[PDB]
Structures are given as structure tokens and as C-alpha cells.
Amino acid sequence: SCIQFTRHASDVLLNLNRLRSRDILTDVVIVVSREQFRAHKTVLMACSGLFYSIFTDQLKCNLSVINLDPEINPEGFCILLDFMYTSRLNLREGNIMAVMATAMYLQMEHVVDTCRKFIKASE
Amino acid sequence: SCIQFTRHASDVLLNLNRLRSRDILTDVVIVVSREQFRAHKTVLMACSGLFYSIFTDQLKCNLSVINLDPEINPEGFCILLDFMYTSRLNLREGNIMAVMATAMYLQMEHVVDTCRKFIKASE
């Protein structure tokens, strides 16, 4: 018999992104080659099969620094991290291959799906 | 020029609620009289003007336990905490006064609004 507030989930996500911008309560640094990205472990797990696996691990859950595979592109990670916190994906011709490869690695199936459909339309 | 995934914010919130149920990465206990509620500080701040004020405070941000005013009803808090993590509000005749008073204290303006409209319709 509950009532539901339609915009609630979007409002929560907007405030989680505000916390990320102000660096409030961030508990991990993701290292992608020469670049560093601060984030909230809970948001990373909620969006990515890879981070969900990492942060449920009894040893890795306590790490303050996570280093990604050297093949991962920092811009691709940046675009996906922005997507995690906003639902918006900055998908462009010049970055689509890097975004799709990063999404496959991060296990972000909905992003992988769309990257596939956008590449298929161009061939 | 971004594309947007409509269900992303709802999917994030559903996984944050799954983390709460499994007690993963919860970093605070909210004490309401004889009852205890584990939660994520980031979600509490994102939903409540009161917790936003508390956890941006340079001293209170590091507390593992927060005690609420003894006038706060545990059931009212429980209903609001469930709302924070799901967008669903279990608003009933028997709990509406407690829910509205707790929402005013927590500074959850959209919940206060609706409680007011539901009470006005019954008078």
C-alpha cells in the first residue's frame, strides 16, 4: 500500500554526484595509468560487476587504492565514472572503442549493449 | 550530446538498498530510543537536510554513532529510512503523525508535503 516519489532516485544520485565533486566521504582512489579518480565504494559496486566483486572481497574491501589493468584508458574510465554518478553517457565517435572496452572490463552490461548497437549502425 | 539510461538511478538505489540489507559498507548506526539502524552516511546526507548538516560537520562526520532526539518515534524513522533507500513511503492512518513529525525533524520536505496533503484531505 506504499506511495512512491518518482524523482527520489534521480535526486539521490544528483546528491551523490555533488558529494563526489566536493570530495566528501570518498573512500577509494581508482588508479588508471598516470591518472587518479576518487569515488565512493558503494556507488562503484552499485554500477559495476567488477567493483561489486572487488569490494565484497574480505581483503580488497579495506583497500584505499585500486589499480586497474594498464590496458584501461583513463578517458574511457572518466566517461564511465561520470555515467555511474549521473546516468549520462558522453558517447562519441572518437571515444566509443575505449568506452566499450572499459565497460566490458568494468562489467557494465547496459553500456556494452548500446556501444555494440552504435558500432553496428556505423558498419 | 550525452545519451541517458532512464533506469540507471533506480538501479543504483536498488543496489544501495541491497548493500544496506547485507550490512555491507554501512558506516553509521542511528540510535532512536531503544532501537538501532545501520546506514550509509552518503545516502542519509543525500535524502535529509538534517544528516547533510550533521555529516558535513568537521567533528560529527567521523562519528560511528548518532543519537536522535528522544521525541523521535523508531517506527517513523524506520519508514523514512526505507523511503530513503527505495523511493517508497509506507504512509498509513496509524503512522502518518509520527512519519510527518520525523520528516520535519529530518528535513525531508517532499515527505512533509505529502503528509500535509493527506491530513488536509481527512479533515
Binding site: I3, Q4, F5, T6 | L89, H110, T114
Partner: peptide, 4 residues
């Protein structure tokens, strides 16, 4: 607010 809606009936879900």
C-alpha cells in the same frame, strides 16, 4: 507522488 504516485501509486507504484
Amino acid at each position: 507522488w504516485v501509486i507504484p
